[PDB]
Design a protein around this nucleic acid. Sequence first.
RNA 1: AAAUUCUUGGACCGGCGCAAGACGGACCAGAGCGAAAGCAUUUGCCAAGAAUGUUUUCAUUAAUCAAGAACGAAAGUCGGAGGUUCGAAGACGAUCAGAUACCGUCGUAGUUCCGACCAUAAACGAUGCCGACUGGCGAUGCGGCGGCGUUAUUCCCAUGACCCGCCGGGCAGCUUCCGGGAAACCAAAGUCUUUGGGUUCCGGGGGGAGUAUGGUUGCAAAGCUGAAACUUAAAGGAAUUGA
Lengths: 25, 106, 101, 98, 91, 129, 83, 149
Amino acid sequence: MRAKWRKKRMRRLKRKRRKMRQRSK
Amino acid sequence: KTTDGYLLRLFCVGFTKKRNNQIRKTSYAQHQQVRQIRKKMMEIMTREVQTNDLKEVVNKLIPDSIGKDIEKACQSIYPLHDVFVRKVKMLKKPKFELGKLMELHG
Amino acid sequence: TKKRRNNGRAKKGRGHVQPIRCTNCARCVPKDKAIKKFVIRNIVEAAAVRDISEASVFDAYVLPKLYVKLHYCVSCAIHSKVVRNRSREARKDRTPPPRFR
Amino acid sequence: SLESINSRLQLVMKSGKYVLGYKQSLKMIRQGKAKLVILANNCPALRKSEIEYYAMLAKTGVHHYSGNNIELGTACGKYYRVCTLSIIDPGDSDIIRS
Amino acid sequence: AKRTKKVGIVGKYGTRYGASLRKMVKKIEISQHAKYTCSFCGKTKMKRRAVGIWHCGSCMKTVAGGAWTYNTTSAVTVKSAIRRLKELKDQ
Amino acid sequence: VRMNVLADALKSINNAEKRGKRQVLIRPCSKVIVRFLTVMMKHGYIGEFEIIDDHRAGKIVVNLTGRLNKCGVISPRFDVQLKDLEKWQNNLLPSRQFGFIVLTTSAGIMDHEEARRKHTGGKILGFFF
Amino acid sequence: PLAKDLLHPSPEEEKRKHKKKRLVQSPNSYFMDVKCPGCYKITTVFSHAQTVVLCVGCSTVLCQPTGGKARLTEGCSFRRKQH
Amino acid sequence: GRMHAPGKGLSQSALPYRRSVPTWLKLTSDDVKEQIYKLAKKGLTPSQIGVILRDSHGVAQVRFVTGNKILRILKSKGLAPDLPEDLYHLIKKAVAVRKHLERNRKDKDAKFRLILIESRIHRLARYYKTKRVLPPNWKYESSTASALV
RNA sequence: AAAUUCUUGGACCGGCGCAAGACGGACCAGAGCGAAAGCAUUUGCCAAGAAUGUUUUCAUUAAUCAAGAACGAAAGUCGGAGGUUCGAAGACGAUCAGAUACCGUCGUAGUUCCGACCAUAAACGAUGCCGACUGGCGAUGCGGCGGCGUUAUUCCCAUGACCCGCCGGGCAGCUUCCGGGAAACCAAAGUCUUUGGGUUCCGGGGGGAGUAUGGUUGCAAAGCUGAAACUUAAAGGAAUUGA
Ligand SMILES: [Mg+2]
Ligand SMILES: [Mg+2]
Ligand SMILES: [Mg+2]
Ligand SMILES: [Mg+2]
Ligand SMILES: [Mg+2]
Ligand SMILES: [Mg+2]
Ligand SMILES: [Mg+2]
Ligand SMILES: [Mg+2]
Ligand SMILES: [Mg+2]
Ligand SMILES: [Mg+2]
Ligand SMILES: [Mg+2]
Ligand SMILES: [Mg+2]
Ligand SMILES: [Mg+2]
Ligand SMILES: [Mg+2]
Ligand SMILES: [Mg+2]
Ligand SMILES: [Mg+2]
Ligand SMILES: [Zn+2]
Ligand SMILES: [Zn+2]
């Protein structure tokens, strides 16, 4: 699991987290 | 442009020459030496062509007479050997006249 | 491990060198890193030279050459055997192979 | 020669004598004390023709400065605009001996 | 004192018409309400009377120009190209 | 830029002594350098030297023997009382028989053994052995 | 060489060294007197003159500034002066 | 090395050991400094007053013929320029760059050098205020610097 | 290897023209300039710069630098203009056990320009800046100095082109028991237990994790600052012998 793709996965997951957060705020 | 309304583009090319005495490998030229060489070719070429007609110009182009003049004129700036008129493009020509063509054919 | 002192290329005080295109594939290679062949060959190679020579309308016609310059990425250069790997100390010499034939 | 004329004007207005303005340069020309007249390139054509005619009458040189009145004034070192000026005494500067 | 952070002249539109529209109208508003220096007298008395018409308060000189700017880059490049064309035509 | 001329002089002598030369050229000169080598002179570690007088900070050419192990400078110039002097020489001298700490006092630039002999503290400059 | 004398360098190598790097700093430039072929007076000109020098009376120009030593107009001779 | 450059140049003038006056120099102190006086009125900074004296008139160093140096002679007479010459030439250059940069906004190198030049003005300006040759309230304004050349 | 594809309504090929937008080969180098990112047709204009030369001027005005500021490839975002080629997405043809790929044909955003954002790259020499010292040798670029002799202008002086040296900065190279280093290797990565030239940033076993949260910047994408609980005896570097 090369770090470039791991970082890309992390960014997508973080974007989903953020969206789900202002959906609730 | 010639005396008759033939407008031409003359491309000339030159290569700096290594000396027989020379030990160095490169034989390059300073950028100012290059700048004043190509304004020497540009100056000579127009003079050799604009002062006379097409047929006189062609007779110069059959040998490398224009190129030979470039050889002698720029030895004092930087010696350079392989000079020719690399290409001549004819851009615009006067109105066709059947009389003048026959002079070109005798 | 630092394999080569110069990093396989010839860039010393530039920072950037423009890229060129390989000839075998279209791999984009920096100009100084690419392996450059300059092959100069006749049009007819070795066995037809007699055939055209006798069929020529001119007397003692000097056959023209063909000047084409090649560029190679490291992958194509190895796979085409223009360059091959060498022993660690033999990597250091950089005189081209003999040019007698 | 713009740099050198800027230098000469700075020296002239450090040491010698001058008048700034059309209505006073005219007085100096009519009295004949004007040694040189300098005009900006954006002054009205009517008055620049007038100044040239007066200078021709009085045998005086005129110089067409190569900038408009704003930077003519800044070249003078003043914080306003001058279109025409008259050097009356060159002082220790070679403005007349251009 | 400084009374606003981002909005300048477009502070008069309140919360209307959208952030992007307000931003892209701000620069045009500033350009059309700015005072320009007159190339004929050197004073900064150039006002836009109507769209395309600029006036000097001191010269009483009127110039045809851009809709929101005193002159446009298209106008200046056309002027330079036309000057060069005339120079070539008269050789 | 150049900040401590004495640091440069002693580093230059130490490199040329380490490589076995016979003379060293010390580019900047000052009273502190001339007074420091005269202390090294009196104990036989260096030979006699010579200062060249241009109308600027002069140069010095120093004759070397083979006796110098290391000369050094301490930065910054700490102040040292008579109570601290035994601890300083415990740190930066090889043994208790030889080696010297040069330290300036109100009595002048002078090494540690006799600086104790006239009961004066001072500011540490360097060491040699 | 370990024991080379730094105190007494020969005039040969002491001449090749850089002006600031001599044992005692010294300039490589000098003063000279230049006389016009026509006029009679002699004028004192710096070797690296750096300015267009013309003999008083504007009879002619003496030397032309260059990147190094000033080139002298021809016919004019010179001799360097000392003290 | 240079203050605002990575170059490390060593080229500099090397003053001779002998600070006497040569025998072949016949000008005495009094008529040398009137030669300096009339050159100031032609309009010349002290930098080139000393230049056109050591190549046409033979005086190697004015400070060796007289007891004073050129800029010290001038203000002792009243002909010194109002602001120091080295600060003057920075302001003159920063005005030219600022004008050129004003006409074409895409010259990034011109913007970078202008930062460097105006930095050297402020470094030098606060030095002259510590030695009290500029008034303590003297400030460099980019708008008004054009008037004083 | 083929197919998708175009093709007697004339493709591909040969000739003559026209238009359009990109791009600037060969020369082109362990050459140059720039703070770095970067920069390659000619000519002109405008402003800047290093080094060299200096018996010019001022006389310590300096060095490194929290906070703060200017520039910052590619990609990406926003308005316009233009859109040749190439080509994320997508479509189809192959191959394959599958093939949302590598191969092929077509092709959108983009790739180009103007004006605004973004501030990250293996943004690398994986190597802070300033200063001093410590071996040689042959080169190369710039400037300067000197010298046999060739070759131009010719009409000789002097400037050019070669040749032989010297000096100062610069890009590198070869060699070395200088010395260092775990070693690979480095004339610096040396002058360090014989430990102190000045100063800035920054690391403290591996993960969790550049993550959560808070703050701040941005139109967005994201940038900067940045934990803990918990988990685990190793993770790792250089070299050696095998496979
Ligand atoms: Mg490997
Ligand atoms: Mg890069
Ligand atoms: Mg600094
Ligand atoms: Mg080309
Ligand atoms: Mg910071
Ligand atoms: Mg970009
Ligand atoms: Mg883009
Ligand atoms: Mg767009
Ligand atoms: Mg498929
Ligand atoms: Mg395609
Ligand atoms: Mg980073
Ligand atoms: Mg890094
Ligand atoms: Mg330590
Ligand atoms: Mg840890
Ligand atoms: Mg276990
Ligand atoms: Mg690693
Ligand atoms: Zn390839
Ligand atoms: Zn007006």
